[PDB]
Structures are given as structure tokens and as C-alpha cells.
């Protein structure tokens, strides 16, 4: 059976309410770097073919209502984690275009460790199951049917695991651009 996980289990923990300022505020600037990499930018006229996105909304002057378009990719992680009863162990810490230009850390540069790529390969596979049965919920009442990649593991694609690996890794990858490492246990 595909296993999905909620997010509504627990209120979140004072040690992970103020992670999140930190982890949003990275979040924004890899959701801008996907789409300001090719020659768009932000304006006033909307369209397809004129190369300006109104999508890319900015981080700083954004209100209560239109934040769920950030946060949303935010409480798939956090919460996820928050399902199991996984609490965050704290180490040490360490380390053109026309508009918004963040001096941020791409995550093209973290290579992961024993302890977290055991605990990384849990979220992957766990990221899988989520949208197989988001899609078994989203495909029952429309007169549903049968879908191919419900199967185990080894019998999958590589660009549906690749574009999985590394929201379920964006944890973890800014977890040790911070420098805090965890430890299974």
C-alpha cells in the first residue's frame, strides 16, 4: 500500500517554529532560481510569450494570504518528519538579470553523510508513495482506474525519483548548509 503522512499530528516545536524563517527565506531563492535562469522577470503584463513571469512573487512584503504558494512545499517537509517522531539533533554551525539577485547557496554542493543518506533515502521513498496515493485520492471518484508505477522500488523511472530525491533531501541539504548534523539513532 502506498503510505502517505499528515501534517496535522503535533503544533510545531519551538526548536523547529524559528527553523522555518531560515528554511522559507532558502526555499524562496531556489524556487526563483529555476525561473529566473532563462531570461524571465518579474513585472505588470501578463502573458506566455512576452518573457515576463507575474508568478515570481517576492519575499519580503508578502501577508498572511498569499504565502501558501512558498510554505506549501515547507509543511510537506517539516510536518512530514514531525509524523514518525523525528526531533532534530543540533551540532555545531558552519558553513545577469533585472531585480531580485539573492547571494544564497545553491544545492549543488552538498554531499550528504552515513547518518543522513540512511535517513534521506527514508524521505525519498517516502515522497513517492505520497503522490502515488495523491493521485489514487485525486483519480477513485472521477471514475478511476489503473495506474503503471505503483510497483515496487527497482522497477521505476529516473526523472520522477530525481525530481523527488531533492525536495526530500531540502532538508537536509540546508540542514548541513547550516552545519548541523543529525544522528539516526
Known amino acids: 500500500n502506498p503510505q502517505p503522512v499528515d501534517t ?8 523547529l517554529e ?10 524562496h ?3 526563483s ?3 529566473l535562469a532563462n531570461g524571465w522577470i518579474y513585472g505588470e503584463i501578463y502573458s506566455d510569450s512576452s518573457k515576463v513571469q507575474p508568478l515570481m512573487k517576492p519575499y519580503k512584503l508578502l501577508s498572511e494570504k498569499e504565502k501558501e504558494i512558498y510554505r506549501w512545499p515547507i509543511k510537506e ?4 518528519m514531525l509524523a514518525w517522531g523525528w526531533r532534530i539533533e543540533r551540532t555545531r554551525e558552519g558553513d545577469a538579470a533585472h531585480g531580485y539577485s539573492p547571494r ?13 543518506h540512511a535517513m534521506a ?22 471514475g478511476g482506474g489503473n495506474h503503471p508505477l505503483l510497483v515496487p522500488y527497482d522497477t521505476l523511472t529516473a526523472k520522477e525519483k530525481a525530481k523527488d530525491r ?10 548541513q548548509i547550516n552545519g548541523y548534523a543529525v544522528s539516526r539513532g
Do not use: C, G
Open 8 to 15: 496535522s499530528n503535533i503544533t510545531i516545536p519551538e526548536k
Open 18 to 27: 524559528y527553523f522555518i524563517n531560515k528554511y522559507a527565506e532558502h526555499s
Open 29 to 31: 531563492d531556489k524556487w
Open 33 to 35: 532560481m529555476d525561473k
Open 77 to 80: 517537509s517539516l510536518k512530514t
Open 104 to 116: 544564497a547557496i545553491d544545492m549543488s554542493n552538498v554531499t550528504l553523510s552515513r547518518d543522513l
Open 121 to 142: 533515502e527514508m524521505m525519498a521513498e517516502n515522497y513517492h508513495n505520497i503522490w502515488a496515493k495523491k493521485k489514487k485520492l485525486e483519480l477513485e471518484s472521477k
Open 166 to 175: 531533492e525536495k526530500a533531501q531540502d532538508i537536509l541539504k540546508f540542514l
